[PDB]
Design a protein around this ligand. Structure first.
Ligand SMILES: [K+]
Ligand SMILES: [K+]
Ligand SMILES: [K+]
Lengths: 350, 213, 261, 350, 350, 350
């Protein structure tokens, strides 16, 4: 248990031999390794290296692997220094996690020589020119599908005299090929369910098939199915990294949307009642019930102010002024949390 | 609301009955029509200028041509002949004025030789010291008779009261006739009879004061 | 089904104010109004006046001053009143339930100069809120639903009497083969009309009732005839049940055949 | 007057023994307690610990207090050091105080067996199953009461045949049993009239009884009694940590709401006068008085803009443009203070 | 020179004696003063104090006259050390001009038996009881001076029969009275004219007197004097430490209001021209000239949206969408500078 | 392998001599310069300046050139320190590059004393009095050109009778003259056309000349030309240092405007479809097609709310409430990036 006087550029740093002996793969825990640096003239190893970063490494030996970065040393020089002392790769990952970066993950691969060949072609698009081509085709089949949905409703517009059935069929044919190839060439049929984008593909392909069946074999129930056709805009989220951050932002902030709608509802039951009672006995617009004023308090608090219903007394007008300012405050109170979450996810890309 | 005197129509014929009013009444598009058999209440024939009230056939049609509202019965059937009124509001909705009517008449009922019934006064009616002579006319079409009384071969004219023709249950007509006579003049002559002529044919029923039962 | 039964004083005096009351069973819980409809014999239809469930009565513009109809939601019943009755006002009165819905409380909220062709056409806040009247986003009705049977109200100063009923049976000459006539005589009664039944409503084969005539003394006259098989002459009990509503009279005179006792 | 030399891992700290004897309960203060870590050969008290954190421990002896954290030493590592030097619990408390973290609050319990059972049933909802049941069945009773208060004033809608009176009566009982059972089980009935939420409960109960009294023994006083019915939504404030943080944010930020309404009023008296004078002699809408324009300047500055009254000249329109921009500025000037207060209270939960 | 070796708790500082000589007065300059600390057993001084804050002291001597604070030492402890070494109150000033904390403006209370005792009654209100009385009655007179400028121009309303003239004059009496007490008791006449709050009083007292002069001896003069009367509500800026901060914000941010109005004008000449050309040949509302659309582009960009004039084609509508988003951006770009200036002035009060 | 012992004010640094020789120009590298301070008695080279700043210098030689700045030492003291040491111009500019002030460039100059004379006259208006005159005549000519553009279209308003052609001909004369005298006196005719502000001048000079030429030669191509005349208001961007920051800001953040318009479009296709289906079978305003509702969802989400089309059922109204709140969120999510870019470019001027 003799004291060892390591010297880093003039700054002496004595520690007990056992404290370093506990870690034997490091530079100072491997005597055949550290011997080179040890100068025996004064019995003190001399390393001419950065001075204010040896304190961290000592704590790692002293506290059984607790590695923390001094906040007056940049990451590059601290990352380089753990390497010279050869604390070891397992140590580096602990440091990497402390910064909080996303340098952990790795994809699997089919590795069968053909399953690997189709999967590379479809899942990853920058890898080869045929692959860049497939994806560009897939943005068009979604854009020529959404154009068909809105046009059908225009007032002017299996007999196949309907071109909004031939064009839908080609679109519900390509989308189905992508779903099937992706399934057969997938490395795992367990993680196929995990991706939400595969579920988006299932939901945007179903209502064409149950419509087909009803004709091939709910009169206003059909309409519930007709709207569920609108979830083909969320097939854009594969070929866009600007939308996947919106996915991760709204999943990590569910509590601060519950708060936004809760705060907004309490006001709509608290300002509406005031204006109904204030404009009670006059030809007061439509304030004929507390339940009626709920439209007026949502339009004034969110600042849209359509102007359909407005107060017409003096008490109504003073309650309208307080309603407008209480809605700029109860809106702007939970939104800084959600804007901050987007900023962390957006820049962490780098 | 002005309507003419009479309209005569047959079985299977189309008669456009006019309601000539004004745009406070027919310009409402909520007029009313009615149907009145004598001896009954009026029954709602039409409402709304085209709408049909319950119990009314779709054949009746409220075609309108301006302020002269029409009624079109395609194929006039038997039970329709009655007094037909116009009705609406006037410059308000809780308000009303009717018309005074027109008679609609249907020809085509079963004609037959009349089943006439005569009743002589009762014995308690002779005890009550009066003599009414019942001469009834039934099962006859067209509804036209003249009411005569017959002493043994000579006419009796005075004291007559008769009713106009009225309808019966089984699609025919019915009538009656009363000769008001003193009991001293009933028990003075030996035989009394009721001559009734329907389309020229006279069916006789005879009674005497001296015949028991 | 709204069942309407009229009850009141039917035989009144000159210069005495009228009163009927229609018993209304079957009140539908809708917007429908009750009134009365009068009709003299040989004279056309005429409205008298209404009342609604709110309290505003409406009458004929020829006749506003001579009606008073009252409401009661506790008995569910409607009434009638006429003043200054004379010989032209001899009428029968049908109580009636009428469907009466109306159509104008619009105002240009903003000054008229602002309301324009472009705005009304393209802006809905202008069209259905700010400028309803200048743009045009603001007519009557009258049709009955439920008629009534009628009650006769006639003005007179004379007195009312009951009927005198007599057995009227066929003779040995008046017989018409296998089917013979049979009936009753209602004579010297006032007023019109009186019904004569048979077997308390069990004999309807050949039922024939006749309208009554007027006399110079002040009484009315009718009789009846039913066609019965002549073998049953003396077998069944034939009872023509005269019921007189202004006098409360029921004379159950049983009709027996003829004999010479 | 002797000079003790401490040696934290090679770094020599020297100090006056008097400064070290100020407190004997501390590891270094008691001669016996610190004697174990002494080295005779070097005449020093060697410790193999963290080099950057002992500067702060020696200030505490030198200043006789004032514990402060070096700002490069992470909170966990510094705390670990105070315990090893046995600074003592009083010092520990002062350290938490300078950062300001609060764990001090403590709530006594009746502990009389019957009282302890009832108070841990109606006060801490997670302590069992029955307390979860009571929490859910109270949230239910509040929610059906609010629907009865709005549908009671729709326009289609003690004889006890009215459904609205019967359903309100049952709720006014549950609300009072919970106030009474809490009052009896409260450990200290001094505190009970001081808590805000206890008061929010009594206010919901008062309107129902005063009516029953009026009806068993106020023309618009009763309309005010109908308004003060509206505070039964605030009974939710116990069953949410979203409303309590809004309560503290609007309590510790009263000055920056006084400023918001004061700034807004000065503008409404300064822009309204300009538009009345500019649109003075023309068929100028309703600008018939300076007092009339106050509605126009509150709707344009808060950005609702209903469109009921607008300027119609050239001077009116230039004053309307300056009014709109001066209201985005005088609104957004005190709101960053209030949004910051919510963020501190919201995250300090952790 | 001779190498003074200064120990500060175990951290040996060494320098040249001529560097200490630069300031003869300081604790290290006078050798009779620093004589107490010297210990000749080790030849070195031992000033036992905070080790990490002596560095800046020695840097002040070496550069001759620069002081800065070490960033991991708090302001209490750095200040305490400056006093112990007596760097002097002029040096303590240098620290102050670096921290920036509000320095003390000289309090020139005047000097005479009553002349000072009156400028204390009016200028400083927290001094006593009657000065509190003058503050409260002056705020009451300002608020019945605004009520009478609004209620006077209501359309329902030296006669002496005129309640409005008499109430207006008692206010002008009191304003003039209070201003003359304070122009006589002022310590300096030249400074009085410079201060803004003396100019506010003068221009609020002018128009009642020059109307009396013209009335007792104007086509648009009379038109505009009634508008310059609205500046009696800036007299309230004396009794309110939340308007003086708004005055300092708007003065320290004139450049970022020039930018706001300049950015807003460029858009109004760039979006208006587009909509006039797009809705050129149709019954297009009032877009009959590029000069007409300027009202539409100010109302859509500031988000008021009255709804008086809206686009009615397809090109007009696409230009209306881009106008709305370009106005949320060109408004929100210079406002963070002005909100930050208010925050510095607001909190620097402490 | 010789250890030298530099001692900066007491804090001893020890290094091998090969490290010192790595850079010859440095004070330590050259033997002649270093020998001046060496003190033979202690064998150490004493210097006497800031101690906390020598670590970055010694880590410079160690790393072979990578120079940093420690986080506690301010910029002035660190810059002055590199100078005393004598490192090199590339080292100083390497510090300036690691710091992030971009002072590297200059401007070529004609060096002919006529080309030089008028290029100094025009391009650098802080030269002389006449250059300030030419800048002010240039600003006034741009302004009267914009005023001429907008007035032309007012309903009331080459035969020389028309004033507007004459005033517009003089402004095009002065624009063309300024552009040609700048182009010939420009020291490169090759870096000219790559610029932007000269391209703006060409674009605002072209359509008058093609109007002139074809006037002397389906919907008027003249009409599209008559739109590209509006870019004469971008020539203020030479005489205004608040438009050039908006140019660099809107360039450096194109990705966060693509995101803003993409997020806004996805909502307009997702909320519009909901309201069309909800208000499907009623006299529902103009919601006669999904393509029609696109105007309603852009006006409600950006908060303008004109009030021309509004929902009129219960499902329409609940979709209108969610539309309003989802547009305050999808607008405020990418705007903090663009406001931050303006702040960096705006303050980096200093
Ligand atoms: K807004
Ligand atoms: K708005
Ligand atoms: K609006």
């Amino acid at each position: 248990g003799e004291r060892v006087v390591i010297n880093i550029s003039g700054l002496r740093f004595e520690t007990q031999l056992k404290t370093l002996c506990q870690f034997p793969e490091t530079l100072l825990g491997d005597p055949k390794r550290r011997m080179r640096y040890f100068d025996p003239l004064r019995n003190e190893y001399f390393f001419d290296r950065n001075r204010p970063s040896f304190d961290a490494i000592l704590y790692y030996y002293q506290s059984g692997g607790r590695i923390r970065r001094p906040v007056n040393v940049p990451i590059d020089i601290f990352s380089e220094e753990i390497r010279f002392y050869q604390l070891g790769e397992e140590a580096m990952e602990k440091f990497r996690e402390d910064e909080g970066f996303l340098r952990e993950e790795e994809r699997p691969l089919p590795r069968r020589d053909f399953q690997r060949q189709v999967w590379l072609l479809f899942e990853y698009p920058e890898s080869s020119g045929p692959a860049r081509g497939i994806a560009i085709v897939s943005v068009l089949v979604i854009l020529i599908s959404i154009v068909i949905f809105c046009l059908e409703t225009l007032p002017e517009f299996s007999s196949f005299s309907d071109p909004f059935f031939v064009v839908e069929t080609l679109c519900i044919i390509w989308f189905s090929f992508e779903l099937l190839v992706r399934f057969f060439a997938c490395p795992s049929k367990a993680t196929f369910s995990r991706n939400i984008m595969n579920l988006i593909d299932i939901v945007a392909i179903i209502p064409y098939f149950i419509t087909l069946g009803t004709e091939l074999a709910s009169l206003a129930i059909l309409r519930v199915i007709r709207l569920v056709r609108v979830f083909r805009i969320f097939k854009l989220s594969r070929h866009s990294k600007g939308l996947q951050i919106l996915g991760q932002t709204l999943k990590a902030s569910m509590r601060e949307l519950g708060l936004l709608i809760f705060f907004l509802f309490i006001g709509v039951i608290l300002f509406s009642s005031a204006v109904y009672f204030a404009e009670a006995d006059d030809p007061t617009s439509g304030f004929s019930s507390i339940p009626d004023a709920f439209w007026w308090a949502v339009v004034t608090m969110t600042t849209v102010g359509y102007g359909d219903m407005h107060p017409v007394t003096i008490g109504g007008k003073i309650v309208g002024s307080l309603c407008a300012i209480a809605g700029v405050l109860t809106i702007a109170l939970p939104v800084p949390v959600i804007v901050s979450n987007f900023n962390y996810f957006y820049h962490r890309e780098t | 609301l002005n309507q003419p005197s009479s309209v005569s129509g047959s079985l299977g014929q189309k008669v456009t009955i006019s309601c000539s009013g004004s745009s406070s009444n027919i310009g409402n598009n909520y007029v009313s029509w009615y149907q009145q058999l004598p001896g009954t209440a009026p029954k709602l024939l039409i409402y709304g200028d085209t709408k049909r009230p319950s119990g009314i056939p779709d054949r009746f049609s409220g075609s309108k041509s301006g302020t002269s509202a029409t009624l079109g019965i395609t194929g006039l059937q038997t039970g329709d002949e009655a007094d037909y009124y116009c009705a609406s509001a006037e410059d308000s909705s809780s308000n009303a004025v009717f018309g005074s009517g027109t008679t609609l008449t249907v020809l085509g009922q079963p004609k037959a030789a009349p089943s006439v019934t005569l009743f002589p006064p009762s014995s308690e009616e002779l005890q009550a010291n009066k003599a009414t002579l019942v001469c009834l006319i039934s099962d006859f079409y067209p509804g036209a008779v003249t009411v005569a009384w017959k002493a043994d071969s000579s006419p009796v004219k005075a004291g007559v009261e008769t009713t106009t023709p009225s309808k019966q249950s089984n699609n025919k007509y019915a009538a009656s006739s009363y000769l008001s006579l003193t009991p001293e003049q009933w028990k003075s002559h030996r035989s009394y009879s009721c001559q009734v002529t329907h389309e020229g044919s006279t069916v006789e029923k005879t009674v005497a004061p001296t015949e028991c039962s | 089904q709204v069942q309407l039964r009229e009850w009141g004083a039917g035989l009144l005096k000159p210069s005495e104010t009228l009163s009927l009351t229609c018993a209304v069973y079957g009140g539908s819980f809708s917007d429908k109004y009750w009134s009365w409809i009068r009709q003299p014999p040989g004279k056309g239809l005429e409205w008298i006046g209404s009342i609604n469930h709110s309290g505003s009565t409406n009458y004929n513009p020829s006749l506003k001053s001579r009606v008073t109809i009252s409401v009661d939601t506790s008995k569910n019943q409607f009434s009638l009143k006429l003043s200054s009755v004379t010989a032209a006002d001899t009428a029968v009165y049908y109580c009636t339930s009428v469907h009466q819905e109306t159509k104008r409380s619009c105002i240009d909220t903003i000054p008229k100069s602002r309301c324009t062709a472009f705005q009304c056409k393209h802006s809905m806040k202008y069209r259905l809120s700010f400028c309803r009247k200048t743009c045009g986003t603001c007519n009557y009705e009258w049709h009955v639903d439920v008629w009534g049977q009628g009650l006769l109200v006639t003005v007179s100063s004379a007195s009312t009497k009951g009927p005198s009923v007599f057995p009227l049976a066929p003779s040995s000459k008046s017989t018409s083969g296998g089917t013979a006539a049979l009936g009753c005589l209602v004579k010297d009664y006032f007023p019109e009309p009186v019904t004569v039944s048979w077997n308390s409503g069990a004999l309807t084969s050949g039922v024939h009732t006749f309208p009554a005539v007027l006399q110079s003394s002040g009484l009315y006259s009718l009789s009846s005839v039913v066609t019965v098989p002549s073998s049953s002459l003396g077998t069944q009990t034939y009872i023509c049940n005269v019921n007189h509503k202004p006098s409360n009279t029921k004379v159950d005179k049983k009709v027996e055949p003829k004999s010479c006792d």
